[PDB]
Symmetry: C2
Subunit: 116 residues, 2 copies
Amino acid sequence: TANREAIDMARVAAGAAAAKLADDVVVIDVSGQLVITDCFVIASGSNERQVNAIVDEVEEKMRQAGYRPARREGAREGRWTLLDYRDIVVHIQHQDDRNFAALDRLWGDCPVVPVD
Amino acid sequence: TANREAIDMARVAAGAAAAKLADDVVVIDVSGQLVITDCFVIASGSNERQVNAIVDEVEEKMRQAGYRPARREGAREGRWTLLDYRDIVVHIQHQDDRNFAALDRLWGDCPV
Ligand SMILES: [Mg+2]
Ligand SMILES: [Mg+2]
Ligand SMILES: [Mg+2]
């Protein structure tokens, strides 16, 4: 399964998104699929303000956890942001833009990490 | 349009993939679309071991040209490997998995 250190990072990220009332907050164990990243963290906002508040909360809480800033990515015209912390990767998106079948297609065979 | 520092990185990464006999090597300018990444370099290997060697070639010359180490990722079965250099992302894939349709609906308007 996923390394304990990676799960702890995921816990911090998911707790930050939950603190800003994100929807779809799930930690995916991708340790059996990928060679580097162990946890994928999904989160969604109902508006773009919230999406960005979730993004900033995750970064601020990850900094407090002692980690270096994520390598970031997003679409200039899109409403998503990708945060790469290596052991984990965080993906935050406006719920209206999400493709949920595509998510399940990609990670449907991966265990959910009950992180609470 | 795409960065000088990125084009000269894509040049190196694509040439390296060329030196180790990759197929369907493409440099895609995504600078118009993305915030951070400026270019993608996609390539195919005929098999998992060729994908492995292609990655080696790319990483070897990128280090030689004094570039930052890649943030790597890969499928555990070696079907694909990705190297993130920030300014460019290199995507090497087993030709059987290369979906050119999905590429088109997504980086089709980008110069290639
Ligand atoms: Mg792992
Ligand atoms: Mg750019
Ligand atoms: Mg190697």
